[PDB]
Design a protein around this ligand. Structure first.
Ligand SMILES: N[C@@H](c1ccccc1)P(=O)(O)O
Ligand SMILES: [Co+2]
Ligand SMILES: [Co+2]
Ligand SMILES: [K+]
Length: 304
């Protein structure tokens, strides 16, 4: 395999971490290839669940706890910390909240969160590499509680970063937030990519095509598929009671991605940097409720 940049995996990985049996597990947790029967049973469906009130309470709770766990990871970000160390803390923090770390064995993903450094677009696997001054790192958290998943991510600065890193991360965040600000009933899901790409391109960045935002609730990934680029053909129209993510990945160079031999780590084909933010959203009537928002502080961690 020819790496696209400077980053390399740092093996070996620690033995997978067990989750105590008192924590409720999603279907894929014990499937030998980590396949989710319940997702496979709706594969290729465009229909979007309208959440009951009970479903809404369930999502509020899991997304709140997911934010708490992300905040834990955010407090650990500094030079010399490894991504495995971050994942270990996340793993214990999920268990402390009586939640299952959704990534763990999802289609055999080996860890409890995703750590994506520099040219990694998403789904980086926590490993023995220590964070370096000047890196940007995304941590993606997903928790499962009482049958519901809640999903968010942020990109962080490790020490001081260069102006390009600052502008990439800020623009990405603005892309997310401009998309969220358009969410309300009657808006087509395919419109969000128009908005995101417009802002990205205005600042000289590209928008990853291969990965999309998604419905989420009882399933981790389900309808709708929510592309982040312009002139996409996503199916469906927002309605009160819909729950889904928006998670744009924006890049300094070209948009094209490829995957490491591990089967997960997605990297820019050009080796330039990519950044991401993600929220889980509920469509209401005034608009939308950001289920994964911070409750105690105005801004994402990178500003703070
Ligand atoms: N949280 C994410 C995830 C976790 C684990 C495995 C695959 C994707 P994504 O849906 O945001 O890409
Ligand atoms: Co995520
Ligand atoms: Co997601
Ligand atoms: K990245």
């Amino acid at each position: 395999y020819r790496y696209t940049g400077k980053l390399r995996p740092h093996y070996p990985l620690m033995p997978t971490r067990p989750v105590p049996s008192y924590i409720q597990r999603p279907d894929y947790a014990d499937h030998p290839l980590g396949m989710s029967e319940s997702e496979q049973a709706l594969k290729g469906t465009s229909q979007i669940k309208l959440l009951s009130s009970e479903d809404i309470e369930g999502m509020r709770l899991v997304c709140r706890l997911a934010r708490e766990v992300l905040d834990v990871a955010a407090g650990m970000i500094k030079p010399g910390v490894t991504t495995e160390e971050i994942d270990h803390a996340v793993h214990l923090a999920c268990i402390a909240r009586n939640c299952y770390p959704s990534p763990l064995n999802y289609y055999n993903f080996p860890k409890s969160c995703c750590t994506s450094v520099n040219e990694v677009i998403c789904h980086g696997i926590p490993d023995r590499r220590p964070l370096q001054e000047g890196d940007i790192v995304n941590v993606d958290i997903t928790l499962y509680r009482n049958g519901y998943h809640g999903d968010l991510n942020e990109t962080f600065f490790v020490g001081e970063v260069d102006d390009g890193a600052r502008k990439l991360v800020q623009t990405t965040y603005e892309c997310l937030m401009q998309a969220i600000d358009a969410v309300k009933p009657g808006v087509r899901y395919r419109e969000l990519g128009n908005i995101i790409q417009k802002h990205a391109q205005a600042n000289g960045f590209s928008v990853v095509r291969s990965y999309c935002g998604h419905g989420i609730h009882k399933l981790m990934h389900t309808a709708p598929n929510v592309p982040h680029y312009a002139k996409n053909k996503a199916v469906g129209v927002m309605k009160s009671g819909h729950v889904f993510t928006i998670e744009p990945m924006i890049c300094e160079g070209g948009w094209q991605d490829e995957t490491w031999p591990d089967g997960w780590t997605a990297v820019t084909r050009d080796g330039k940097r990519s950044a991401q933010f993600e929220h889980t959203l509920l469509v209401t009537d005034t608009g939308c409720e950001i289920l994964t928002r911070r409750l105690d502080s105005a801004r994402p961690h990178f500003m703070s």
